[PDB]
Structures are given as C-alpha cells and as structure tokens.
Amino acid sequence: LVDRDPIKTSFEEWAKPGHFSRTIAKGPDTTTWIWNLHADAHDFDSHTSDLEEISRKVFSAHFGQLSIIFLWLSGMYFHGARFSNYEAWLSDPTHIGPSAQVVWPIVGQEILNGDVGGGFRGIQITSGFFQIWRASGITSELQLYCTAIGALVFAALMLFAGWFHYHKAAPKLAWFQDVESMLNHHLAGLLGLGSLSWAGHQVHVSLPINQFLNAGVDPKEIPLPHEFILNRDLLAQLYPSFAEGATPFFTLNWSKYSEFLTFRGGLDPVTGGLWLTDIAHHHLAIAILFLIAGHMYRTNWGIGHGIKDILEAHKGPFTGQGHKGLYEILTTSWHAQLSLNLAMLGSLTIIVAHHMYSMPPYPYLATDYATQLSLFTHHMWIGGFLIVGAAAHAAIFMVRDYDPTNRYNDLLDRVLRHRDAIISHLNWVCIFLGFHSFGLYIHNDTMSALGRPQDMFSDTAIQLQPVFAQWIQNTHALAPGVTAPGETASTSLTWGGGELVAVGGKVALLPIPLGTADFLVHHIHAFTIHVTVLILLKGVLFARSSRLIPDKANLGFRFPCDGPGRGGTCQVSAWDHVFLGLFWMYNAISVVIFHFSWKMQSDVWGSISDQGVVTHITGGNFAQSSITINGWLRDFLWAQASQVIQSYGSSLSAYGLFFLGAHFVWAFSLMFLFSGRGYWQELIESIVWAHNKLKVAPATQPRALSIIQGRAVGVTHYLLGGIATTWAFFLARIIAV
Amino acid sequence: PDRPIWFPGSTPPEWLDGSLPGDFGFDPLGLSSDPDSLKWNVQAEIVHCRWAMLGAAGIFIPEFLTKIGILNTPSWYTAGEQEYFTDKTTLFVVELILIGWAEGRRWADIIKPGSVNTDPVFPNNKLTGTDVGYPGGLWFDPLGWGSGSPAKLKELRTKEIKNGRLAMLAVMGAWFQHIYTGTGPIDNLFAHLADPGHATI
Amino acid sequence: MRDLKTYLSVAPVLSTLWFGSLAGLLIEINRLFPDALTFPF
Amino acid sequence: RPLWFASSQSLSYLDGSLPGDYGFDPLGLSDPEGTGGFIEPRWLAYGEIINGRFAMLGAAGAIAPEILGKAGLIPAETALPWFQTGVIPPAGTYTYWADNYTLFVLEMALMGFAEHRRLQDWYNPGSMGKQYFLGLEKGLAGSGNPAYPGGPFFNPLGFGKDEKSLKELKLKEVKNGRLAMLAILGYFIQGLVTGVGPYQNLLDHLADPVNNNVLTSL
Ligand code: CLA
Ligand code: CLA
Numbered sequence A: 001l002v003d004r005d006p007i008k009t010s011f012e013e014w015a016k017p018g019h020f021s022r023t024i025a026k027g028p029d030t031t032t033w034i035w036n037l038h039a040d041a042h043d044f045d046s047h048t049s050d051l052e053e054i055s056r057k058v059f060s061a062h063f064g065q066l067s068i069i070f071l072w073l074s075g076m077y078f079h080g081a082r083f084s085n086y087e088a089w090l091s092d093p094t095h096i097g098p099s100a101q102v103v104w105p106i107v108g109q110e111i112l113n114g115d116v117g118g119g120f121r122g123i124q125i126t127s128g129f130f131q132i133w134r135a136s137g138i139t140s141e142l143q144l145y146c147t148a149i150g151a152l153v154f155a156a157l158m159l160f161a162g163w164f165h166y167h168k169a170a171p172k173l174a175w176f177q178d179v180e181s182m183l184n185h186h187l188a189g190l191l192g193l194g195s196l197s198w199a200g201h202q203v204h205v206s207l208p209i210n211q212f213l214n215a216g217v218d219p220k221e222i223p224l225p226h227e228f229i230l231n232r233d234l235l236a237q238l239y240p241s242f243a244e245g246a247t248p249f250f251t252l253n254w255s256k257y258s259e260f261l262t263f264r265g266g267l268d269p270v271t272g273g274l275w276l277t278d279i280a281h282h283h284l285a286i287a288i289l290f291l292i293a294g295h296m297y298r299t300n301w302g303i304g305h306g307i308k309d310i311l312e313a314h315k316g317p318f319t320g321q322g323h324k325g326l327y328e329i330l331t332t333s334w335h336a337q338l339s340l341n342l343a344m345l346g347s348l349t350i351i352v353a354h355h356m357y358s359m360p361p362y363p364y365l366a367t368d369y370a371t372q373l374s375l376f377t378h379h380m381w382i383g384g385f386l387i388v389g390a391a392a393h394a395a396i397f398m399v400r401d402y403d404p405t406n407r408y409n410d411l412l413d414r415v416l417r418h419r420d421a422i423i424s425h426l427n428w429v430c431i432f433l434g435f436h437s438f439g440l441y442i443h444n445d446t447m448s449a450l451g452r453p454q455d456m457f458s459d460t461a462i463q464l465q466p467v468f469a470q471w472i473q474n475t476h477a478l479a480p481g482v483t484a485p486g487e488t489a490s491t492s493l494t495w496g497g498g499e500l501v502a503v504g505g506k507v508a509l510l511p512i513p514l515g516t517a518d519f520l521v522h523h524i525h526a527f528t529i530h531v532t533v534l535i536l537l538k539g540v541l542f543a544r545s546s547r548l549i550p551d552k553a554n555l556g557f558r559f560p561c562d563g564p565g566r567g568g569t570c571q572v573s574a575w576d577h578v579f580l581g582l583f584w585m586y587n588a589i590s591v592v593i594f595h596f597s598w599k600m601q602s603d604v605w606g607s608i609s610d611q612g613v614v615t616h617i618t619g620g621n622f623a624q625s626s627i628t629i630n631g632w633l634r635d636f637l638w639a640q641a642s643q644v645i646q647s648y649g650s651s652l653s654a655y656g657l658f659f660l661g662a663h664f665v666w667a668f669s670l671m672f673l674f675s676g677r678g679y680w681q682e683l684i685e686s687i688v689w690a691h692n693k694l695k696v697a698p699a700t701q702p703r704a705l706s707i708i709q710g711r712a713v714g715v716t717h718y719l720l721g722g723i724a725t726t727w728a729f730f731l732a733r734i735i736a737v
Numbered sequence B: 001p002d003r004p005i006w007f008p009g010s011t012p013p014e015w016l017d018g019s020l021p022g023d024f025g026f027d028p029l030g031l032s033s034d035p036d037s038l039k040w041n042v043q044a045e046i047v048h049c050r051w052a053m054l055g056a057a058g059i060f061i062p063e064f065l066t067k068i069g070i071l072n073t074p075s076w077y078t079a080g081e082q083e084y085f086t087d088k089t090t091l092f093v094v095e096l097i098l099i100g101w102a103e104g105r106r107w108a109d110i111i112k113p114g115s116v117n118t119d120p121v122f123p124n125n126k127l128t129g130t131d132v133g134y135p136g137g138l139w140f141d142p143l144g145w146g147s148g149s150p151a152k153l154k155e156l157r158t159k160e161i162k163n164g165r166l167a168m169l170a171v172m173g174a175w176f177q178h179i180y181t182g183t184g185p186i187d188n189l190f191a192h193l194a195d196p197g198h199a200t201i
Numbered sequence C: 001m002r003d004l005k006t007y008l009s010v011a012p013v014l015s016t017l018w019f020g021s022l023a024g025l026l027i028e029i030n031r032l033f034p035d036a037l038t039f040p041f
Numbered sequence D: 001r002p003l004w005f006a007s008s009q010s011l012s013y014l015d016g017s018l019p020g021d022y023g024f025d026p027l028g029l030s031d032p033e034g035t036g037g038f039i040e041p042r043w044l045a046y047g048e049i050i051n052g053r054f055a056m057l058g059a060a061g062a063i064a065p066e067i068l069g070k071a072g073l074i075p076a077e078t079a080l081p082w083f084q085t086g087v088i089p090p091a092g093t094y095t096y097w098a099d100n101y102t103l104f105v106l107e108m109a110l111m112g113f114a115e116h117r118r119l120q121d122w123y124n125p126g127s128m129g130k131q132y133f134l135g136l137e138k139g140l141a142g143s144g145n146p147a148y149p150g151g152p153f154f155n156p157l158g159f160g161k162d163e164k165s166l167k168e169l170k171l172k173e174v175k176n177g178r179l180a181m182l183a184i185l186g187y188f189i190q191g192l193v194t195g196v197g198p199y200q201n202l203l204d205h206l207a208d209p210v211n212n213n214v215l216t217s218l
C-alpha cells in the first residue's frame, strides 16, 4: 500500500509563494496577502479535500519534528561536554552549581559569567540534566560526545526518512486506517520493549556505577561500564546473586534476585532520591504489563478483538444506540484524534509535574530547589497549553467534519439536544464557587482592616479544616505493614510519616501539614478550573448554531462577527472562545504556581543544624499570612521581589533586565486588545498621503490588521509578557537563596 | 549522444549535449542549467585549470630537484615566510595592480566579446582569436597551433581540460599531504614506494 | 539554477542575510573600538 | 505441488513460477498489492538469490582453513577461526602484507565497481554491453534475467543447456542457498555463546553428546 514517486522533487514551487492555495498564489495586491500566507501554512485540510493526501502530508511533518528534537538533544548533550563543569560537579554535587553555558565578552556582557564552583565561570542551568547524567552512570565527557554524535546521526536519518516517505514511496490511505495494528505495535514494541531495554541498562550499568559513587569512590577510579559485563566477578562481588546467572529466572526462583530488585519505598539517605533497584523493578514490571497489553486487537490471524465490535456492544436505556458509529468518526477525521490526544497528553503532563516533586527520582535533585521549581512550573504550563488546544481542535472538528447524514452517532446527538441545561448548571456552579471561595478572602481583609481578628476564617478564630485530605494522609502514612505488607516505608515522605531526610545540611522532604489556608486555595483552584471548563465547553457546544445566529456553521470556524445587528454579535465564533479561555488558563496556572512556590518555601525547604532544628526560607508564615489578599501582596510579592530588583551589577542582572522587558511586553499588548481596526485604517490614510507627496508610496497598499489577527497578537503578547515576568522573578528569587 | 559518460548506463543532463570539449555529462546538482551559468562556469574552469597546471609544475618540479640535491630551494609551504628585497605588502600591491590590469581586459571580453582585441597604444597590433577563453594572436599563440579544423581544436582543448583537472587534484592533494603528514610531497612518494602496504594514512 | 536564485531574492532571506552581515560588522567595530562616548577626531 | 505452511492469502500470488516455491509467506510480504520501495516481489527474489549465493561462498570459507589445521596440512598460524582472523581486531588479529584498513579500501573499490555495474544492469537491462570497458563489454551484455545473466563470463562451461535441467539446477541452487544462510546464522550464534570455533563445536559434540550440548552450554 505505497505509491512510487507521487511528487517530483523540484525547486519550482519555492519561487512561487502561496502555491498551496489558489487565492494566495494570485499575487500581493495588499499587505493582507503576506499575513494570510503564514496563517494558512499548515492547514492541510484547506489545501485539498483528499484524505489520502492529507494523511501523507501529516506523516512527513512528524519526521521533521523528530529531527528537530534530535538536534535539540544533540546540542544539549554537546554543551555539557565542552562548556560545562560536569566532572567537577560530580565530585561535589552539594556545593557546586551546575553550569553549561559561557558568554563571549564583547560589550561588558562577560559579567554574566559568574562563579559557580569548580574553577568555572558561566551561567547556572536549572534543567536538571546533570542529575539525569549521573543517574545513568555517565562519568567522563567522551560518553557525552558520543551521545551528541549519535543524536546528530539520528536527526539526519529522521530528515532522510521524512523526505523519502513523501517523495519516493508514500503509503496509501488503507495503510493509515489500520488502527488495530498501530495500537498493537505502539503498545508491545514502542513502550514495552523500550521499558525492557531501559530496565536492562539500569540493571547492567546504572546500578554498579551508582553504588560505587555512593560508596564515595573517586569517579576516575570507577571501572568502565563494559568491565561489569566482561568480568562477571565484579558483579558477583557487588551482587552475589549474579554468580548464579539466569538459572533462577528460568526455574521461577525469582526470590534470589531480591538483592537488586527490591520493594523498599521512600528515599535514599545518601542522595535524597528513590532507590534505583525499585526503579529497575518498576520498569521490568511495566515492560511485562505493556507487552501483555499489546496482544488484544485482531489482525491477519483471527485471534483478538475488533474495536468496532467492542464499541457497538455498549448502549443503555438512557443513551439509546450508544457507541455505534464512533468507530467511523475516529477513523476518518484527523481533528478529533488530535483533540483527544492533546487532552490526554496535557492531563498526563500535569500528573507528571505533580508526581515528580514529591517523589524525587534523581540523585541530589530534592536539594536543588531551583531545578524543582523550574520543572514544576514548566510542566504545568505545557499541560495547560495542551489542554486548551484539545478544546480548540474539538471545536474545529465540530465546525468542519460533523455530518449526521453519513456519520450519525446517538451519543453526540443526545448531548447537543440539551446543551442549555449543561451550560446553565455550569454557570451556576461557577458563580457559587466564585462567591464562596473568593468571598472568604474579602471577608478576612475587611475584618482585619476593621480591627476584628477574632471574626476571621483562620486556624485561631473560625477553622475550616480539610478533614477529608487529612484522612487520606493518615491512611497513606499507615499503609505499610497493614495494607501494603511488602513495603518497608511509605511511597512519599509528604504523607505524614514523621521521618525527615536531610542531605548536605538541607531539608529534602518532610511531612506537609494541611490547614485552613489550603482549603481556601484548593477551592480557588477548583473555581478557576471550572470557569475555564465552562468557557471551553460553551465554545465547543455552540459551534454550529444558537438561538441568536441559527446559521453559525455557514460562517465558518474563524470569523469575527455577524454585524452590529441583534444588539451586537461580537466574538460569537468558536475561535473567540479559545481566545477568551487562554486568559483564564493563564490565571489558573499562575495561581497554582504561586501556591506551590510559597508553600514549599514556607513549610518544606530549609536548613538543618547539628542539633536538628529546621529553619525554613521564609520562617513558616504561610499559615497566618496567606488568608488575606494583603498578605499575598506583602509577604509574597513585595518581600520576595527584592532579589530581582537588586540584581544589577552582578551575574543575575539578566533576570533584572528580563523583568522590565516582560513588563513592557505585557503592557504593550493592551493597545491591540482595547482598540479597533477602523481607527488604525483611518490613521494610515494620512500616512500614505505624505508618501504619495514624495513619490515613495508602495504598490503593495498598506492595510491595517484584521480583527482576528489583532486579537491573536494581543493575546500572544499578553501571555508572553506575563509568563516571562513570572519566569524572571522565580529564577532570580530562587537562585540567590 | 554516443559519447562515453561518467556513469555508464545513465542519462546525461539535457543542457550537456557533448558540444563542449571535455564533456562527459557530469552535473548531478545542475549548477549550470541556464546558459549564462554554463558560459561563466566554462570560463572559470578554464582559468582554474591553467592556474592549477602552473601551480602544480611550480610545486612539484622544484621539490623534486631539491630532494636529489641539484638545488637547495626551501619548501613550498614555508616559501612565503622568507625575507625578500622589499616588504610583502608592497609586492602584493604591485601584483594587485598588474593582475588587475591583466584580468580587467579579460572581464570585458566575457561580457562583450570582440571589444578588447585592439592595442590601445599601437593600433597596428591585433589579437586574432575568435572564441571566448582562447585569446589567440601572436602574443598568446606565437606558434600558430591554435587554429585549424574543428577536430584538432576539440582534441587539443579536451587534452588541456583533462590535464588541468588532474593538476587541480594534484595541487589539492599536495596541500593536504603537507597539512597532515608535515613532510614534503616528494618524501611522501618515496615513503609510499618503500612500504606500499603500510605507508598510508 | 534560476529557481534557486529566485528563492534567494525573497524578502525574508535577503533581510536575514543583510541583517546578519550588518550585525557582524557592528560587533567587529565595537570589538576594535570599545567604550566610545564622544567623537575624538 | 508440495506446500509448506501455505495460506489462502499467500497462495493468491505464489502460483509456483519462482524456483523453490512452496507457498510459504505467513506475513504476506510478497503481496503484489501496493508494491514500492524495496518491498517488491522481484527485488525480494533477487535479494534472496544474492544472499543465498553469498552465504554459500561464506559458509565454506569460514570453515575451510579450520578443518585442514586439525588435519596437519596448513601451518597452525593460518588455521584460525573466522572471528579471530582479523574481522574483529579486539577478538584477535593477524598481520598480513598490509594493514587491515588499507585492504578495506581496495576491497571497497573493487566491490564498488562490480556492484555498481550489476545495479546498472538491473536498472536498465542490456546497458553494460554498450560502452567500451577494456573490450570486455562484449560478454557483459546479460540475458534479460538479472539473477541469471549467463554469457561466456558467468557461464563458461555452458551448463543448463536443457530448460528442464536448468529448472532443476535453479531449484538446487535455491535450496543450497537457504541451507547456507541457516548455516551462517548458526555460525554467528554458536560463536556468540560458545566462544570457540564451529569445527571445535562439532568435534566436542562428537566427543560426547550429553555433556557438550545446548543443555550444558546455555
Ligand atoms: C500537536 C499539537 C498541535 C498541532 C499538530 C496543531 C495543528 C494545527 N493547528 Mg493548533 N493548537 C495547538 C496544538 C496543535 N495544533 C494548541 C496546543 C493550541 C492552543 C494554544 C492550538 C490552537 C490553535 C488555533 C487557535 C488554531 C490552530 C490551527 C491549527 C491548524 C493550522 C496550523 C497553522 O496554520 O498554524 C500556523 C502557525 C503559525 C502561524 C505559527 C504561530 C507563531 C507562534 C504563535 C508565535 C511564537 C512566538 C515566538 C516565540 C517568537 C519568535 C518569532 C521569531 C520570528 C523572531 C493545524 C492543523 C488553526 C486552524 O485549524 O484553523 C482552521 C487555528 O485557527 N491551532
Ligand atoms: C525607503 C522607504 C521609505 C521612505 C523614503 C520613507 C519616508 C518617510 N516616512 Mg516611512 N515607512 C517606511 C518606508 C519609508 N518611509 C516603511 C517600510 C514603514 C513601515 C514600517 C514606514 C512607516 C512610517 C510611519 C509610521 C511614518 C513614516 C513617515 C515618513 C516620513 C517622515 C520621515 C521619517 O523618517 O519618518 C520615519 C520613518 C520610519 C519610521 C520608517 C522606518 C524605516 C524603514 C523600516 C526603512 C525601510 C526601508 C525599506 C526596507 C527600503 C528598501 C530599499 C531596498 C529595496 C533597496 C518620510 C517621508 C512619517 C510621516 O511623516 O508620515 C507620513 C510616519 O509617521 N513612515
């Protein structure tokens, strides 16, 4: 199912911009043509109506994405070998700050090459690559150079594959629609075999090298990874069970492998991370489970399941026919699959962000506060963006590919017939949550201002205790020995076990208390999430029609309005709902990251002394100061911003410059959001007049930006400015202290 | 159409029809698809060939005689670091002026053929050439072998082109050999002939 | 190739080349003569 | 005709034209729908024939110096196993009249000439007998079948005069090539797990089968 040489390789189409569209290829009468060229670059569905060609175009771009990712990985690995102090950091991870970037001295920018330890001058990095390299057994820079070379080779291979599968042998449509085979392969081979290979690498390389490192041996005296394979005596000395070979595995005497395959739980006191034996056992079990899961769906040999057969058998007295017809929708529309995958990926990213901080998987990662904060905020933002994109593409599918005549589905029909109740109930829930979550903050502020601290919602006057979460913490703290007999310690130290882990005089992790403030902040999170969901679902559900504009589907997915009639019809399209929900996503993620930062700085992170007294960074003021808006403004925003505003003249002045630059970018966006196109089109007419006077009027007539373009520019600049401000503030605050 | 090709069994590019001397249909990247680029590349190849042949002679003949002891000339690699009767920038300026006058008239013949064939000072003296790149005349063709039947001209120009390509390859090889081995080009040949099995990169 | 030369004359590529050369020239000029506040000649 | 693990899908296009055809294709790689790239029945047959011929050359080569060494015919310094004769220098090396990397370039040049001529025959049939090649292009014209070029160079003895005899010899060649490929896989994997010469493996097995065996080696 491939075609030989579908499209000739030529430079002819390079010299004719806009060849993908008939209208754009005509020529640039005005300046709107240039903007329209870029906005429709990757909309393959608008270029042609053939599903096979769209699938072939989609298949090739992923190869370019993979090549770009491989180039990025190659650069990251190469910079750590040539412009880094990784070897010096390896001998003292607790007193040296990782750095992998140096700057050329031209205009006085060499001040950014601050001292970081190990006789090195550079920029301190917070991506956590040093911990990953240490956990993999990497010791010298030659291995990093080899990894960079391999990544370059893989990027070249990906680029060649991308060219080949589009210009020499393009698969047919019947190849793409083999969902059962694709699922079987991506489950058994992509995931299970990868987990098995990583488990093997961890067993044979990471474990002995990491044990030698934790023993305190000089990294230059540790035997090379290949010495543990050729010389089984070394492994037998390290692990006696290796002397028996693979015989216990094939005789089901798996108890002999308990030395390097454990079920301990908790953190390693030496490094502050999870035990590597637990990780190896976890990867082995996950590989087995994924290998089993990949033999469910039917193929050329009869045995297995048919996804259509599974779907068609589920229906209920409330839902009618049920899931019949969903198989044909998901195997014919690219947008629905994209929306579902984007939503699932965003949720998974948020879950990963939440899980990484409380269960540190890398050595010397819990005590690196900047890395933890950066990873948390980065992954949360990525998850939010993916979640928004899911709804955007769901609306796109609803507008374009919906067709009840040939693709009828009962479940989709029933949802669209009672959307008013869903929207009204969601509106009521949002209003109730906003009143009963944010209103308690204003009450506390008013009572504090009036001089009545005894009438506030606080731990000392009127308690609002999160009794349900405390019960979960108590249950999980008592899990070992009762409901998890095979475990020695709890999964996390934050459950409330009472034990504290200190590495290098710093607090890695300890139980986290929950009080009245956590109740309020959690309900604030719920309120913001509910409002965002309301906006996106209202946008998706009313994409085709409404009581105001019955024929909204004919106007398309991205149109500005339908005139000033009916009192005003501004921003009625589904695109405008995504444009509006991006702001609320930004708001929710900012509140969440502020909560995380303040809570960790106030109740977890700190230093321990010889007598064992913990002194936190901010002194534990979160409980009594976060219950008012004035407290958030004073003890968090005003107090913690002194690091970034006093960074001039030092190696951290770049963050100080980025603070003001992001301020300017954020403030600059309000011009596009608060104004309209007619004023700017009328203003241009006067500017064109004087150019005509001096014979400098261009033939490409200048036109003001369209309404949609202006809204997009405004939202983009707004988001960029806000995120850059928060990034600069966080990094400047956390690197110094 | 029946001429030998660089890749037997393949099809030569359309713009290479075998009319030019030394034509084997080798143009994988199509750098001379349009005629103007073809003419410019032909002129550039001719100039590169002649310069390379002169350089190859001047590199290899002096180094051969030095090894056997007839002369005691220095290495071609370090011949630029000796001291001469004047500063090197003065020689460079004199060279720039002279070769600017020389190559300037060559540029005009390429753009507008048949316009620089007359002596500016003594109009009685003319160049007899008719093809771009082959000036002819008594100054450049004193022996009179440069005119005749088309077969003779094609044979001679093919010989010149092939010899020039070989000279270009030889000069690049000598430069890289001196970069890598750090020894004179003649010494490398004797080393290879001493132990052909092992005298290698 | 005529079509390859045509693609090199498009506005973004030409602008990128011009601005790269310009930035290189300015950086070299500032490297040769650093910390200039007044015109002394 | 006999069949070996044939299937309804496989039998729809394996009608027995090819030599050594038993209808064996469980994965359906020779399915002639949507052929392209390197997945094509003609290219697959050509690759099978070439791989079989090379394995036939390699199966005897990796064992010929070994058996004479134990037979006292060649000097013991040349009776090395295939994996120590210099293929993998870490596994062992032997000094020839030139270093290994120098031999590699000459081998690559000669094999490049040969394989490029063969590939250019495959792409456009009958081409190699046109251009002047030291006057040897008269006998390199081929025969129209890429895997069986024939001619005075590749068929000096003039074997296979009769069509049925040619069919029989093609069948024998295919069978021997498959057997040689299996033998080469056995060579590689036996060398991987035992670390000694395959002839030594056979001699050890003949010494006693119950003590030198898969149950005792693994
Ligand atoms: C797997 C991820 C993925 C994929 C494959 C797609 C694919 C697609 N999306 Mg999409 N989208 C995604 C995630 C994804 N999206 C997410 C997460 C969101 C939410 C933010 C959206 C929101 C979205 C909207 C709102 C729209 C699409 C549209 C489209 C389609 C046309 C794309 C196009 O023309 O863009 C062209 C690409 C660009 C113009 C590049 C944008 C430049 C960015 C925004 C600025 C970057 C700033 C940078 C840092 C500054 C440096 C500048 C430099 C020059 C100096 C295409 C099928 C469009 C569509 O289907 O219309 C019918 C459409 O209107 N998407
Ligand atoms: C060579 C082209 C050119 C010329 C001669 C002028 C000349 C003028 N412009 Mg102007 N302008 C240009 C391009 C040009 N503009 C472009 C491309 C833009 C869009 C960014 C503008 C935007 C603009 C505004 C908004 C205003 C003017 C105004 C003016 C007048 C006041 C003088 C001045 O310095 O204004 C300031 C000039 C600028 C800020 C322009 C920025 C410089 C541009 C980027 C240079 C680009 C040149 C272009 C690349 C040419 C390529 C040449 C190449 C093909 C060889 C003056 C008559 C003012 C006026 O009196 O109103 C009528 C005014 O308010 N211009």
Ligand code: CLA
Residues within 6 Å of the ligand: B166, B169, B170, B172, B173, B174, B176, B177, B180, B181, B188, B189, B191, B192, B199, B200, B201
């Ligand atoms: C006319 C071209 C030419 C010739 C005759 C030689 C000849 C020689 N080179 Mg050499 N070389 C050449 C070009 C050439 N080179 C070029 C272009 C480079 C740059 C990559 C080099 C780089 C190079 C190195 C680094 C070394 C040599 C060395 C040597 C000597 C040992 C043989 C060897 O290992 O060659 C190896 C040659 C190559 C790797 C280059 C490929 C050959 C080119 C493409 C020409 C091919 C020959 C030609 C097609 C056949 C017809 C011409 C024939 C009559 C000579 C030998 C005298 C070695 C030495 O010093 O000896 C002691 C040595 O260490 N060469």
Ligand SMILES: CC(/C=C/C=C(C)/C=C/[C@@]12O[C@]1(C)C[C@@H](O)CC2(C)C)=C\C=C\C=C(C)\C=C\C=C(C)\C=C\[C@@]12O[C@]1(C)C[C@@H](O)CC2(C)C
Residues within 6 Å of the ligand: B026, B027, B028, B029, B030, B031, B048, B051, B052, B054, B055, B056, B057, B058, B059, B076, B077, B079, B080, B167, B168, B169, B171, B172
């Ligand atoms: C041209 C050249 C290289 C050629 C490159 C090739 C084959 C490219 C081929 C292709 O393009 C084609 C055909 C078609 C395309 O589709 C594909 C490619 C593959 C791209 C080498 C040398 C080119 C140029 C050379 C040889 C220069 C010579 C130098 C001289 C004269 C030196 C003289 C002196 O040495 C003396 C005499 C004495 C000393 O003391 C002083 C000095 C000054 C050092």
